[PDB]
Structure 1
Amino acid sequence: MNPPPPETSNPNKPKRQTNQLQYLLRVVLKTLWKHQFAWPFQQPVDAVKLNLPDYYKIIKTPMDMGTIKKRLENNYYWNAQECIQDFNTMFTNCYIYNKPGDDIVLMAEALEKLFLQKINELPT
C-alpha cells in the first residue's frame, strides 16, 4: 500500500548548481534536519508501517525532507524556488491530512517557521 516514492534522479531534467541551491542544502535543509521535530519528515510516509492505508488515498503528491535532501545532494533542481516548492508540498501535505492541534502538525508548523526564517534571506 506504499506507492513508489518521488524520484531523486532524472537524467533528462536540466540541472543547475546555483548558490541558493547550495545554501538550501548546506544551511537550510541541514539545519531543519537536526531539529527535535524533524524525524517524522526525514523519509517518505510509510503508510504500511504506520497502518494508515488512507494516507495515500488522500495525499497524491507526496514529499519529504529525505527526498528533498537526496534531490539536493544529486543536483536535481534547476533553481531554488523549485526546491522551496517541494518543501511547501511537504508542509501542505501534513496540514491537508491532519488537523489543527495534532502533534504532527505542531511539529510541521514549527519546522515551517524555522524554514521560512531561514529562507527569508538567500545568497545573491
Structure 2
Amino acid sequence: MNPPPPETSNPNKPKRQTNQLQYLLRVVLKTLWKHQFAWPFQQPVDAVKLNLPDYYKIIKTPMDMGTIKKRLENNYYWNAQECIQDFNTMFTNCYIYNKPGDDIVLMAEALEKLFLQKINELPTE
C-alpha cells in the first residue's frame, strides 16, 4: 500500500500569522504550483500507480507541494524555516531516489532554482 500522506493539521501546536508564512503561501507556493514542471510534485508520490515499489523503501521522509499547501493553510508551521525545510526535503527526495541528469531530476532542479529566487525575496522577519 502507499503510506498515508504527511500530517498537515495538528490541534496541539500554537498558531501564528507572520510576513514570511503569508508570502510562502501567497507567492512562493502559488508560483511553483503553476510552473510547467510542477505536476509530479503536487501530491504525494503514488508508488502503487507508478509501479515504484521501492520508493517508500528508499524515501522515508516524503514531502510534496500538496502537503506544504495544506500545512501553510492550516498554520502548521510556526517558523518559516520549517516550510523552507519541507520544500528542500521535496527536492532532495527527488535527487535521492533518482540519478544525476535524470529528466525528473532536471524538473526538480528547475523548480528548486525558482524556489531560491523567491526565497531571496522573503520579507524581513
TM-score tier, shorter chain, comes to over 0.9
What do residues 85-110 of structure 1 show as CA deviations (whole Å, max 9, x unaligned)? 00000001000000111111010000
Moved beyond 4 Å, runs of 4+: none
Any gaps of 5 or more consecutive residues in structure 1?
none
Q: Distance in 2 between matches of 1:67 and 1:17?
A: 18
Q: Distance in 1 between matches of 2:52 and 2:12?
A: 34
Q: Distance in 2 between matches of 1:118 and 1:89?
A: 17
Q: Distance in 2 between matches of 1:12 and 1:53?
A: 34
Residue in structure 1 matched with residue 95 of structure 2 by the alignment: 95
What do residues 9-29 of structure 1 show as CA deviations (whole Å, max 9, x unaligned)? 001122221110000000001
Q: Distance in 1 between matches of 2:17 and 2:4?
A: 27
Residue in structure 2 matched with residue 107 of structure 1 by the alignment: 107
Any gaps of 5 or more consecutive residues in structure 2?
none
Q: Distance in 2 between matches of 1:32 and 1:100?
A: 22
User: How large is the Cα RMSD of the aligned pairs?
Assistant: 0.7
Q: Distance in 2 between matches of 1:15 and 1:56?
A: 31
Total equivalences in the alignment = 124
Question: How far did 1:121 drift?
Answer: 2.1
TM-score w.r.t. the length of structure 1 is 0.97
Question: How far did 1:114 drift?
Answer: 0.1
